Amino acid sequence: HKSEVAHRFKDLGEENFKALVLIAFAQYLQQCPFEDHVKLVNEVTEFAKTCVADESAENCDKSLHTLFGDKLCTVATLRETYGEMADCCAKQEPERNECFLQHKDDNPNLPRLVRPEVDVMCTAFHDNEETFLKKYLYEIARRHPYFYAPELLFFAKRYKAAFTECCQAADKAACLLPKLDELRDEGKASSAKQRLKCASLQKFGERAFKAWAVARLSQRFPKAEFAEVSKLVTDLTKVHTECCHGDLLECADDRADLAKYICENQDSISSKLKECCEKPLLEKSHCIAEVENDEMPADLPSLAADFVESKDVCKNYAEAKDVFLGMFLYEYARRHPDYSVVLLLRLAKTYETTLEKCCAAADPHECYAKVFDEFKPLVEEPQNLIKQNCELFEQLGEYKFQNALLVRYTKKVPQVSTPTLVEVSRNLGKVGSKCCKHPEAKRMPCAEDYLSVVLNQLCVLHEKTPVSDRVTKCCTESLVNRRPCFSALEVDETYVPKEFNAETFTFHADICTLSEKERQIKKQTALVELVKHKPKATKEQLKAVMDDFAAFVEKCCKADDKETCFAEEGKKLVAASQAAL
Numbered sequence: 001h002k003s004e005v006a007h008r009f010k011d012l013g014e015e016n017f018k019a020l021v022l023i024a025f026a027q028y029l030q031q032c033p034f035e036d037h038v039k040l041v042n043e044v045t046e047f048a049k050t051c052v053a054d055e056s057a058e059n060c061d062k063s064l065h066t067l068f069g070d071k072l073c074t075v076a077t078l079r080e081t082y083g084e085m086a087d088c089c090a091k092q093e094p095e096r097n098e099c100f101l102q103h104k105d106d107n108p109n110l111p112r113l114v115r116p117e118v119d120v121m122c123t124a125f126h127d128n129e130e131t132f133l134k135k136y137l138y139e140i141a142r143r144h145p146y147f148y149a150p151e152l153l154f155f156a157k158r159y160k161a162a163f164t165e166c167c168q169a170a171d172k173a174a175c176l177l178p179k180l181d182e183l184r185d186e187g188k189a190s191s192a193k194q195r196l197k198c199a200s201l202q203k204f205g206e207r208a209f210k211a212w213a214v215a216r217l218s219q220r221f222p223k224a225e226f227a228e229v230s231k232l233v234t235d236l237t238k239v240h241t242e243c244c245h246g247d248l249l250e251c252a253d254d255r256a257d258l259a260k261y262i263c264e265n266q267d268s269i270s271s272k273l274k275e276c277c278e279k280p281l282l283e284k285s286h287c288i289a290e291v292e293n294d295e296m297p298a299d300l301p302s303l304a305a306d307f308v309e310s311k312d313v314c315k316n317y318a319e320a321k322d323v324f325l326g327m328f329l330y331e332y333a334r335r336h337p338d339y340s341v342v343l344l345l346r347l348a349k350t351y352e353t354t355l356e357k358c359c360a361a362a363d364p365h366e367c368y369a370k371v372f373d374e375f376k377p378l379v380e381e382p383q384n385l386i387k388q389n390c391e392l393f394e395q396l397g398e399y400k401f402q403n404a405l406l407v408r409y410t411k412k413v414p415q416v417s418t419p420t421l422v423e424v425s426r427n428l429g430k431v432g433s434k435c436c437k438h439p440e441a442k443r444m445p446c447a448e449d450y451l452s453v454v455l456n457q458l459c460v461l462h463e464k465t466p467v468s469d470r471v472t473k474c475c476t477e478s479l480v481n482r483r484p485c486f487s488a489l490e491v492d493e494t495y496v497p498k499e500f501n502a503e504t505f506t507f508h509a510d511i512c513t514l515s516e517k518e519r520q521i522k523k524q525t526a527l528v529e530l531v532k533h534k535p536k537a538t539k540e541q542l543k544a545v546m547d548d549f550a551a552f553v554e555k556c557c558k559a560d561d562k563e564t565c566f567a568e569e570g571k572k573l574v575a576a577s578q579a580a581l
């Protein structure tokens with residue numbers, strides 16, 4: 001263990017080191033040009049090979065934290081470009097690394113990355129493959145300076161995979177665009193989850209996080225003993241607190257540790273793990289954390305012995321409340337992978353709340369014998385909406401369904417921005433497609449999964465530009481109560497309808513040109529605007545107007561002189577709708 005650079009270069013491989021060095025630098029120095037970092041990276045790599053050859057050589061003894069610092073502080077235009085940051089360089093180390101972390105900018109002012117024409121990509125990718133990929137790695141890096149670097153590195157390679165396949169396929173855009181849309185979407189998702197998880201830790205504190213993890217880890221490793229789960233939860237909770245804080249190496253090394261541990265103690269934890277524990281350093285902890293729920297033990301009791309019918313319960317509770325409730329959750333979670341992490345927390349919070357009454361009451365055993373009764377309705381609420389709504393998505397496909405929701409929520413929260421209403425109805429809709437194709441024993445996690453990100457995205461927009469007290473309530477409640485609070489929203493019976501607008505219901509023959517996506521967005525803005533103009537309108541009345549609009553369109557887009565039909569027939573539609581409503 002002579003040299004941390006040498007170890008990390010041996011550990012990683014040149015090609016990975018190089019990628020990670022690049023992502024590291026790109027995250028701290030977001031206003032420098034790609035070609036500058038190639039210079040850095042290669043300067044570091046060239047250096048890193050010295051030490052691999054002879055860990056005694058100049059500076060090899062130095063700390064990665066110290067060599068990264070020294071590198072940063074030899075950028076000349078550093079005060080010019082960044083200003084405050086430069087002042088960090090005047091600190092001797094331990095603080096200096098902190099000072100660079102402090103003065104990172106999350107969310108700079110940078111132009112949106114344009115996706116080129118398919119053919120430009122494939123061509124460039126052929127012409128010069130590495131410079132193509134790293135360039136774009138450099139661009140996502142600077143735009144997400146707090147994203148775990150090897151996770152990012154993992155996407156680059158799924159990216160490389162998608163070029164390698166489709167730029168040798170006759171119909172390039174037919175292949176590539178969905179693959180890339182998948183990845184766009186799967187990275188915004190990921191890059192939100194991290195922001196949520198960290199924000200959850202600061203606001204709600206370390207306790208609740210452990211609660212969450214226990215439920216989770218127990219769902220995943222049901223054969224493990226509660227102490228093992230506790231060992232895991234604990235270290236895992238360290239890991240999130242350190243990775244949030246933004247130190248790459250602390251986050252990395254901590255994670256590495258945990259992967260060693262899990263694979264060394266493999267038999268104690270999960271059968272479904274051999275696979276992952278084969279994969280090399282970088283992929284290990286990624287893989288572990290993605291992995292399937294292990295199959296549950298056949299020989300499995302009711303909980304009721306240890307948590308209802310035993311005496312010694314109030315003693316066992318009071319002896320250590322958080323550990324006893326831990327045990328409750330461990331036992332309840334591993335019996336139910338088909339529950340949402342959050343569902344299981346509603347059980348524990350409800351349980352908790354009874355013992356607070358019943359251990360302090362005259363007859364404890366009798367104050368609480370009817371408590372798993374209290375769970376019955378808590379488990380059915382999420383189960384029912386799933387059945388109800390996945391039934392409804394079965395009737396009307398993804399699209400007709402999106403419009404069902406678009407009506408639903410526009411009624412509930414009419415004050416929302418119309419685009420905002422369209423995007424979430426659209427996004428929700430998609431969840432329906434994804435999660436409803438699973439069986440019932442597998443739906444409720446999937447949906448928690450998705451809803452949680454949508455529901456957050458929702459609440460960030462709202463944080464920035466507030467529009468509704470009732471929304472604010474949900475976004476400023478526990479991540480446990482979040483989804484129900486939304487489900488609890490009712491039709492806004494206060495709402496004053498919006499002044500009719502001629503232009504809003506005028507359409508032109510340009511929509512017949514537009515892609516089915518493009519069209520649908522046009523149609524769907526209308527439907528909202530319609531809902532916001534005549535909210536007191538019935539589904540029947542609405543399916544009426546919607547069907548007319550639909551015929552109208554397909555009349556003027558199967559007609560000579562399209563433009564003048566849209567002005568004339570549209571004149572009718574509006575008057576005849578204005579009427580019916």
Ligand SMILES: CCCCCCCCCCCCCCCC(=O)O
Pocket residue numbers: 008020021024044064065067068071150248249252253255256259281282283284285286
């Ligand atoms: C001059 C030195 C600059 C810093 C070097 C770049 C940092 C790369 C090291 C990250 C190692 C990641 C370890 C994998 C842990 C995991 O499984 O996620």
Ligand SMILES: CCCCCCCCCCCCCCCC(=O)O
Pocket residue numbers: 207208210211214230233322323325326345348349352478480
């Ligand atoms: C290894 C011990 C883990 C500690 C387990 C904590 C048990 C608490 C379970 C109830 C859910 C807590 C959610 C936070 C919000 C609240 O209820 O106040």
Ligand SMILES: CCCCCCCCCCCCCCCC(=O)O
Pocket residue numbers: 385409412413416420421424458459461462471483486487488
């Ligand atoms: C920026 C703020 C936008 C807010 C959009 C308000 C619309 C509410 C959407 C909540 C969807 C959650 C799914 C709940 C399922 C249910 O209806 O029971």
